[PDB]
């Protein structure tokens, strides 16, 4: 039984999914910060906007 | 206003009457299930009602063992009960020739009468409850297991079973809200039936000190 760096190297499709996901999150992250700093963000009914 | 106070009056009457029944004095069932609208029917609205008199009750007697043993219930009006008022109550009591009586205070009662409330007479004793407490009957609260008082023979048998001396049992304080509810004196014993996590039940005994 053995463990080696072949066993912890990322695969092909992972690169593409990671790329797309990371893009998606950042755009959404941008959208929220823009909604806040313009004051258009809708305060969640349990806390303040921040 | 004049509706919340009447609700309070009905509630305090209901709870106190429940306590009278529980202690075993004479009581009529039809009054146990008296409704608030029924209270309005039998007693007028707050502006037309006089607190120091209207609610005063003495019908209960110890019919359980002696119907001739009358008991008296009083309801002062002033926020803090004064010495003169309890002197009037005690002279009325002596006229009625009874042993004990209950007093309901609105907000408090004066310190000199606090001191007097322990030494009126060996043959006479008085018990004071807060309006705030009486608003709810603890016996019905979810966190209070059923308490039961027993006769001296029962305690005799119990102490004989476990081969115990009386001063070995677990204690319960005299000032305990339930102990006050039952009006039990020092040296009595109380059975408890704790509702188990399941259909079972555990019995335990506590002494009043």
């Amino acid at each position: 039984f053995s463990i080696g760096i072949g066993d912890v190297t990322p695969g092909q499709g992972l690169l593409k999914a990671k790329y797309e996901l990371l893009n998606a999150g950042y755009k959404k992250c941008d959208e929220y910060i823009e909604a806040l700093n313009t004051g258009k963000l809708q305060q969640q009914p349990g806390c303040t906007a921040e | 206003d004049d509706e919340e106070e009447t609700y309070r009056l009905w509630k305090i009457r209901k709870t106190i009457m429940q306590l009278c029944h529980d202690r075993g004095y004479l009581v009529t069932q039809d009054e146990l299930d008296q409704t608030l609208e029924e209270f309005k029917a039998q007693s007028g609205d707050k502006p037309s009602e006089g607190r120091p008199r209207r609610t005063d009750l003495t019908v209960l007697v110890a019919h359980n063992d002696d119907p001739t043993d009358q008991m008296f219930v009083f309801f002062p009006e002033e926020p803090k009960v004064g010495i003169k008022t309890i002197k009037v109550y005690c002279q009325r009591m002596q006229e009625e020739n009874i042993t004990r009586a209950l007093i309901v205070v609105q907000q408090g009662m004066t310190p000199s009468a606090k001191q007097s409330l322990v030494d009126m007479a060996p043959k006479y004793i008085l018990e004071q409850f807060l309006q705030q407490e009486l608003l709810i009957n603890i016996t019905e609260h979810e966190l209070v297991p059923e308490h039961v008082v027993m006769t001296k023979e029962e305690v005799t048998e119990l102490l004989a079973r476990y081969k115990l001396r009386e001063n070995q049992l677990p204690r319960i304080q005299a000032g305990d809200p339930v102990a006050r509810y039952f009006g039990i004196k020092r040296g009595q014993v109380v059975k408890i039936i704790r509702p188990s996590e399941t259909a079972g039940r555990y019995i335990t005994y506590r002494l009043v000190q």
């Binding site: 009914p45 349990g46 806390c47 | 206003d1 509706e3 919340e4 609700y7």
Partner: protein, 107 residues
Amino acid sequence: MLLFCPGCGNGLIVEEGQRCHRFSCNTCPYVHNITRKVTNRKYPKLKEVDDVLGGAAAWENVDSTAESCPKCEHPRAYFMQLQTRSADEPMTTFYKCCNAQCGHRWR
């Protein structure tokens, strides 16, 4: 808001010793009678009125319109609102629901 003597630059107090109240100094005989009115206070301080009408209080504040929950919509949580701190300070609106065995209360 504070008042000060033109003659000595010290704080002024208000007193009456004649037909008309005056601002006056306790160091120099400068006095200024107040023939008219002014409209700014010190914003005094008394604590929170919480339970003056606690529990099932008076029924005169009934109202018709109310909101509803997004989950269950059972019949009993009619609206209320309240205030935060002070005259120039804001108001806050909350929504609270209480049947049993939960903790719900929205903002």
